[PDB]
Amino acid sequence: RECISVHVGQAGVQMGNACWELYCLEHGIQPDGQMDDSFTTFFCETGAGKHVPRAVFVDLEPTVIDEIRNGPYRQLFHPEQLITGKEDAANNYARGHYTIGKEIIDPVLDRIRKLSDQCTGLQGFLVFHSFGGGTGSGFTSLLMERLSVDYGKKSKLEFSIYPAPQVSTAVVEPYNSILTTHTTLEHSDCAFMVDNEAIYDICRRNLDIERPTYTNLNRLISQIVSSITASLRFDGALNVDLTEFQTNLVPYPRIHFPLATYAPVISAEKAYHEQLSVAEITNACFEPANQMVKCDPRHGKYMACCLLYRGDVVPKDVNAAIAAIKTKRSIQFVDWCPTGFKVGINYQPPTVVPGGDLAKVQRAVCMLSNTTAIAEAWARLDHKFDLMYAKRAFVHWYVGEGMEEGEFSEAREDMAALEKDYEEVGI
Amino acid sequence: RECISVHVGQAGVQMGNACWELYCLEHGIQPDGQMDDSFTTFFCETGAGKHVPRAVFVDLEPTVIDEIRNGPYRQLFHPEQLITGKEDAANNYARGHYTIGKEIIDPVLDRIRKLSDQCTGLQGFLVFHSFGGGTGSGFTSLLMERLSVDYGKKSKLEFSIYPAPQVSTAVVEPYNSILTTHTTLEHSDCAFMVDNEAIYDICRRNLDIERPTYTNLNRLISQIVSSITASLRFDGALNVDLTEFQTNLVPYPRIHFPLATYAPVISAEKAYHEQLSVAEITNACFEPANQMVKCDPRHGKYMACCLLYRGDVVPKDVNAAIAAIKTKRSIQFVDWCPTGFKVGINYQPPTVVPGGDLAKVQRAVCMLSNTTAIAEAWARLDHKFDLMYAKRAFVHWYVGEGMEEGEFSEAREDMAALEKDYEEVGI
Amino acid sequence: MREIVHIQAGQCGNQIGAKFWEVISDEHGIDPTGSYHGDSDLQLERINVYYNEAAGNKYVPRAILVDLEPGTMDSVRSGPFGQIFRPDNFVFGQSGAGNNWAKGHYTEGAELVDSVLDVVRKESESCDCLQGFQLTHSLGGGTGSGMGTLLISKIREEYPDRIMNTFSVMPSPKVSDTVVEPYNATLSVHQLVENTDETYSIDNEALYDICFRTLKLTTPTYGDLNHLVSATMSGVTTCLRFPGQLNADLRKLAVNMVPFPRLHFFMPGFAPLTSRGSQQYRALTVPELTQQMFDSKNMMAACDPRHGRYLTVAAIFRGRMSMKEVDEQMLNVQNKNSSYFVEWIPNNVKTAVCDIPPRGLKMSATFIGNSTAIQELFKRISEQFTAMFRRKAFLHWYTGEGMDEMEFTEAESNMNDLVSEYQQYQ
Amino acid sequence: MREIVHIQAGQCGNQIGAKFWEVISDEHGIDPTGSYHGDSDLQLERINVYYNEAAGNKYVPRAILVDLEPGTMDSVRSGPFGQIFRPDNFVFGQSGAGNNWAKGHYTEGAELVDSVLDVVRKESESCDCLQGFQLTHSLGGGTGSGMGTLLISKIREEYPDRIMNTFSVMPSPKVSDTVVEPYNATLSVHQLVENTDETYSIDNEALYDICFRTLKLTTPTYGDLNHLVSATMSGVTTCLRFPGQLNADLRKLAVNMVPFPRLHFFMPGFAPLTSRGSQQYRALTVPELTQQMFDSKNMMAACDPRHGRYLTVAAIFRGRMSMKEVDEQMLNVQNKNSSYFVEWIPNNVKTAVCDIPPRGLKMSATFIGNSTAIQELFKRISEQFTAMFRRKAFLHWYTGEGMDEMEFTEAESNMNDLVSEYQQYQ
Ligand SMILES: Nc1nc2c(ncn2[C@@H]2O[C@H](COP(=O)(O)CP(=O)(O)OP(=O)(O)O)[C@@H](O)[C@H]2O)c(=O)[nH]1
Ligand SMILES: Nc1nc2c(ncn2[C@@H]2O[C@H](COP(=O)(O)CP(=O)(O)OP(=O)(O)O)[C@@H](O)[C@H]2O)c(=O)[nH]1
Numbered sequence A, B: 001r002e003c004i005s006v007h008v009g010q011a012g013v014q015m016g017n018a019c020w021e022l023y024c025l026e027h028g029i030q031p032d033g034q035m036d037d038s039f040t041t042f043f044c045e046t047g048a049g050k051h052v053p054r055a056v057f058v059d060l061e062p063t064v065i066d067e068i069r070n071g072p073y074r075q076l077f078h079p080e081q082l083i084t085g086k087e088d089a090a091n092n093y094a095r096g097h098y099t100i101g102k103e104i105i106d107p108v109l110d111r112i113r114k115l116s117d118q119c120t121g122l123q124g125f126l127v128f129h130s131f132g133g134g135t136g137s138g139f140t141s142l143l144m145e146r147l148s149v150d151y152g153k154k155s156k157l158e159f160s161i162y163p164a165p166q167v168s169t170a171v172v173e174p175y176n177s178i179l180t181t182h183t184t185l186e187h188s189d190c191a192f193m194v195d196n197e198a199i200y201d202i203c204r205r206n207l208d209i210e211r212p213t214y215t216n217l218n219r220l221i222s223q224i225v226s227s228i229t230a231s232l233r234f235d236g237a238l239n240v241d242l243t244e245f246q247t248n249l250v251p252y253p254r255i256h257f258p259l260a261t262y263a264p265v266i267s268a269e270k271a272y273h274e275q276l277s278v279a280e281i282t283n284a285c286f287e288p289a290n291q292m293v294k295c296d297p298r299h300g301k302y303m304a305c306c307l308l309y310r311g312d313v314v315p316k317d318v319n320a321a322i323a324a325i326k327t328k329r330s331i332q333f334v335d336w337c338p339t340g341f342k343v344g345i346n347y348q349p350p351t352v353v354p355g356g357d358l359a360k361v362q363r364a365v366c367m368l369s370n371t372t373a374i375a376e377a378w379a380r381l382d383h384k385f386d387l388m389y390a391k392r393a394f395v396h397w398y399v400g401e402g403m404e405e406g407e408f409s410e411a412r413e414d415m416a417a418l419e420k421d422y423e424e425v426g427i
Numbered sequence C, D: 001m002r003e004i005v006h007i008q009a010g011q012c013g014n015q016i017g018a019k020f021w022e023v024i025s026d027e028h029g030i031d032p033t034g035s036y037h038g039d040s041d042l043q044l045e046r047i048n049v050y051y052n053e054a055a056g057n058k059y060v061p062r063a064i065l066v067d068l069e070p071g072t073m074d075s076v077r078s079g080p081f082g083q084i085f086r087p088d089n090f091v092f093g094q095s096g097a098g099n100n101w102a103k104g105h106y107t108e109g110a111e112l113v114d115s116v117l118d119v120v121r122k123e124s125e126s127c128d129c130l131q132g133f134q135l136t137h138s139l140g141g142g143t144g145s146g147m148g149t150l151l152i153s154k155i156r157e158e159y160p161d162r163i164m165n166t167f168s169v170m171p172s173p174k175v176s177d178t179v180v181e182p183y184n185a186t187l188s189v190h191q192l193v194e195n196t197d198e199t200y201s202i203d204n205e206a207l208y209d210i211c212f213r214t215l216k217l218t219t220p221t222y223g224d225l226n227h228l229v230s231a232t233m234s235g236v237t238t239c240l241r242f243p244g245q246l247n248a249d250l251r252k253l254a255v256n257m258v259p260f261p262r263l264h265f266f267m268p269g270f271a272p273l274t275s276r277g278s279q280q281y282r283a284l285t286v287p288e289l290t291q292q293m294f295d296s297k298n299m300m301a302a303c304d305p306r307h308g309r310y311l312t313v314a315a316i317f318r319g320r321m322s323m324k325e326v327d328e329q330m331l332n333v334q335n336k337n338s339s340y341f342v343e344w345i346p347n348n349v350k351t352a353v354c355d356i357p358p359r360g361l362k363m364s365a366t367f368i369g370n371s372t373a374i375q376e377l378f379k380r381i382s383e384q385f386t387a388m389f390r391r392k393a394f395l396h397w398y399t400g401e402g403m404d405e406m407e408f409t410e411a412e413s414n415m416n417d418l419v420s421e422y423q424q425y426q
């Protein structure tokens, strides 16, 4: 059992630098490249007393790549795997897909082929990017389309950072997100999502960090993506694999948008005063403001829900906790899936980074759940897109790259097709 | 079992100086001329505690010969074996063949006779030259014709450096190559080939040497020609001899042009991070850009393929690797030879030069394979020759030496005969 | 003599199967390394009924562990009794089923089912005279319900005369650790109702319900749940593993418990179930055990028997005891509760006893009941399947492996049929 | 008494031949220097059947190593048992054949074949009464197939009455370490089918296939492959090297296995083949050995016997055992699988046993089978030869030694004939 990953954009490599430092300290891998069947999923055996991750950080702009080469984690990652481009995507879906995308996929696509040939138990793929930019939108759809036609049957765990409702980093991110989702709607099996102001709200209230940064945001994100793959690494009472995320969460092949959340988030001084059990954290993850997306779950209905625990959590009190969620009428489940619960447990507990913002806890939980609540966000993104599309704003840059007005209409109607599917399935 | 070699031209002696320093450090032969049945193939026993190579460096221009006499390796080579001429061939096929060639072969041809009489297990011959020049084109065809009529039955392992498609050192190299190949097409049993920009591409991508020189190019070439003869020197699990290159690679007596490649090429800092096994390098040598010739193997079909490994390579994982190449449809084999695989293994591992660009590796591979892909290069060389031949460019120098217009027509049609044979055999 | 071929399919089947060899190894007095260190000579009298003899007085178990996930075998092999199993029997795939019945039955199971049939054929021909097959699986998931039910079909084709025994755990709505349970459940009972001769319906919530009231474990794990259900696996095969005054083979249990070819879904139970803090305050005499056996809350299924009528019941006792007190307890237990027993059968109880009780207990028994209350489980399972099937939810993944939606309807046709069959006899 | 003249031709024949003297030297208890250090007196009873007596109680082997490459003899002479061989027997050329049948048969072999005939004549007349010739070669290459098959023709001319036994490894399409295999293969079987009385068809890929499943070696070398095939060479000649209850000489094996003069290409096998991590979990009794002998995957040939029918089979057991369990296992193995055995022969099995097993094992046997599934190897070898011959590929090198293309066609005529001969009796 093994799995490979590729990181795209500033959002990907910043999570890439933050997640692989977490994976190395879990398995006792020192940052100099060296220290049985626990690290074989992500890390390889480089002859004798040396390891290499199964990672390929790709990015067109070279500032992030050489910083990793001149960073602290020099000897861990392969120097050849750290791919760098020549010219930035420049916040354009077309530029990272046709001009700069086509001339760099050929080094990239053949690399993941031979990097998979040395492996034998490749379960699937997981990517890290953000559709708010150019390289995260154009190049990501290109490679994911280029490998889906080759492999197809293997899974694809997308991790995209969508823009917030009112907070935003760019101005043309509806154009970047609406075009790349036209290709991602059919090829991606599942895609977990993260938001900007929502994750700031997590560390503001519970973790009381009044001045956080992206370095702190990626740590708890690393706890999420490391905890979902913690079942295949360490032994568990109920082992789950990456293929469970396709069967239990995707009721229809074109409705493949779960939410993401995590608990308990608690500081050092607050950890010793707050009680740690499954009952209080089971209510915390279902709390609406404790999610990683500004979206009201009370408005919609949960299509499916998955739970994955860590640490010394016995199966008694965790089953009594979810039974209290079923009779709690604050949230409402859809009639099309009454038994929409997938429980998981791993024995290895949540770790802690030296000097990190999160505290050590003897148990944790991460919930991924499909719901019809995210239709209003697509309505919001589609609504604001019509305001700029009516004035033809920021269009001359895309057609200057090689595109036209036609596929903008395809990107509009394809999201319009998604809304009528979300209101139909939500009946 | 023994074998002798003669080096012609600047290309030969530069490889001659680079390959014999590799042969001496393998057998523990210090450069001062002294240190059981391992060195007897190439080096002789000079009485007691002294050796001499079975080498004769011949060249018309004297700058390379006396530099070897005043070089570091003075005591290894015999002072009489280092033959020097009086006047340079001057980039002319005719001048190194008739005027300067005829007056120097008589010291040379009788030397290889008596230098072979002291030997008893002479398996064949191997030469080193480049048809881009005069002495490498005219004098090489003269001596190889002069010994083929005498011996005939013995093998001839030609190692010629052809010009690149767009890169080139001279301007009249089509005239030099087209004339000397007219005589080499019938007398040579087999001829491995090397290119100029292709070998630069090897050290650029994988070895990351952005400023290499010919001294660095000849080192990895020495690894190739030393690894093919490594079976007769050291003991191996499956010993192969020089006569295997005639039977397994030459399907027809006038189609005798294999390719050449080598793997793994990896630097010092990259060797410790990259995993070393037969699976990854078996895919590397079949990679099209990892060859020593700018030629697409996907366009043609491999007539025959030979493999020779070194080091601790067990016969299990090497057989599973080539089985994956058979089912891989990225390359296509010809129907005239389905079982076109010749596997070899030697126990002695690849060495490393002190201060060399290549790193130490516990295993290696070198692939020599006949294919119909090289017909386009002969079409390219024949195509550009017609442009200069139509204007009679650079012709007055050849006829000033003693030739005429007739044999230029024979050189043209003889290569034209080769193209119709390559498209017929490629069906 | 009457060997039983064990076959552990699925994750849960490997766990309870691993615990099954653990609990009986202490009864026979077998070391985890494989050597004998018991005390009684009767342990060697019927050690060949489950184990095979080898050199050095070592006894390897006749267990065939099958699973589509290699991490499960690493946990079973690294267990306390993991080293006693044969390494050749550890056959397994590499890619998991991901809780999909179609994957483990058509594509992922079909590549491995050719590999397991040659292994079970070795254990079948190596024995003197095989009796049946003792299989463990789970109706949830893909590898347990898909591949486990597949080889039931193949073994029925090869050995149609032998007994096909299954200890199958099944899902419930109160405790559900998987979304695709009713689809996997309704597809599995289509094969169990036609092919197998006997099946034990074990509900996971009742494993938790029994540990609160009677055993009152404050920190119960899955290993504690495996202990009580594995004791029932030892109780059913006690008569042929040790001598007794009234032996009842697994076939002798089948004819008394299976009045019709489809009505063979049983309801197991076990006693004494008493905590350490209340062991001294209990009498080991049989009337205190008999009232616990037929108790509505003692069984490991959530179906309340008072809402229906018992079709037929069996109780296999263990330990030296008096037969008059044993037999007379079966009289008053049924006549006082005649409403909870069918009037068209004069005697629903089947008796059996053994002279060799478990280690550490002097008196014990196992409750085996075929009751019409089990249709309540088929009711709620059918409604969960019909609720998700009526809009074709979670079916597009099954169609990827070439599975047709009519087979789901055919499985639905079997569901209401066996439901109405139990309703006929109530 | 019934001496066997060993002759090691080719590179692979010298390796397995060197391993053949190694494995039997431990059975007879011979030091590598040549002195005896055994324990049993029966080792000296039939030490002359392969060795020759000399001064100082030293026993030199009757081995004749022939090869056209002097580097091979340096590796064999510098081996563990390289010093025991006679220096005079090490006859060899200087120039290799280079994988060409014409060179080692017409020009390179003809200069040396005059030198080897005087050597084998010395070992033949020095013995008391020669029985046959135990030769090892490979159908690939030039020195094994060209020169090795040449002296088979000359020995047939001089000794037409003696047995000509050959342990010949042959190529396959999945594992092919040489381009000129089908040309060398089809030319070699033209001589083996006419001259030799018995031949063992060993496929190189099956040597790798058996080491994964049963032996599960993680780092197998060629020496490990030589060990299992050399055990079969010891099994065929066990009856005359040690006493037994039912002795079967090599001629006694020939008449039972060779029903027709051309159908003598056998399919060897050996058991027990068990790893060290699974030796304790196996019983050495004969029914577990018999099912391994007739197993489709146990043999060292890739031809599946279930796709055809066995013409005749022989099993030479070793070690003290009970004959009833041995004989009755031969009954149920053939009648239960009557489709895989010809109906026009009442009993296809040949039995034999010895009282002296190998050192370190108490029970063992060797499987020898002549089956019609071997035509699948002749099918794929013929198609590879016809695919390359139909455009005269790689033939101009053979014509240099004066070889005619009609001989390739005559070899092709023999190929389809023996293929159709096996198809007649299926
Ligand atoms: N009484 C016990 N129940 C268990 C145990 N482990 C799991 N389970 C229960 O059985 C349910 C499903 O059984 P499994 O864990 O075996 C899922 P399976 O391995 O068959 O499929 P995959 O793991 O996806 O390949 C599961 O949701 C639990 O409710 C256990 O150790 N003891
Ligand atoms: N089971 C083994 N097979 C071997 C061994 N050595 C080689 N071979 C196999 O036999 C094939 C050919 O046999 P040889 O190595 O003897 C080639 P030969 O010596 O007869 O001709 P030349 O070496 O060209 O003079 C060869 O390609 C291998 O597949 C070995 O040690 N053990």
Ligand SMILES: Nc1nc2c(ncn2[C@@H]2O[C@H](COP(=O)(O)OP(=O)(O)OP(=O)(O)O)[C@@H](O)[C@H]2O)c(=O)[nH]1
Pocket (backbone or CB within 6 Å): A009, A010, A011, A012, A014, A015, A061, A088, A089, A090, A091, A092, A130, A131, A132, A133, A134, A135, A136, A137, A161, A168, A169, A170, A196, A214, A215, A217, A218
């Ligand atoms: N949460 C989080 N988001 C990030 C981080 N880094 C970048 N992003 C997201 O990335 C988005 C910008 O798109 P990018 O693909 O990174 O654009 P870029 O890398 O600057 O390259 P160009 O698009 O060519 O300008 C922002 O809206 C952020 O939300 C990070 O470290 N943490």
Ligand SMILES: Nc1nc2c(ncn2[C@@H]2O[C@H](COP(=O)(O)OP(=O)(O)OP(=O)(O)O)[C@@H](O)[C@H]2O)c(=O)[nH]1
Pocket (backbone or CB within 6 Å): B009, B010, B011, B012, B014, B015, B061, B088, B089, B090, B091, B092, B130, B131, B132, B133, B134, B135, B136, B137, B161, B168, B169, B170, B196, B214, B215, B217, B218
């Ligand atoms: N790869 C490689 N090629 C070389 C080297 N030295 C010379 N050559 C080749 O030799 C070619 C020139 O032909 P030469 O025979 O060397 O000509 P020359 O030695 O200068 O003598 P003249 O032909 O008389 O001028 C060039 O095109 C090179 O490609 C070398 O060290 N390495």
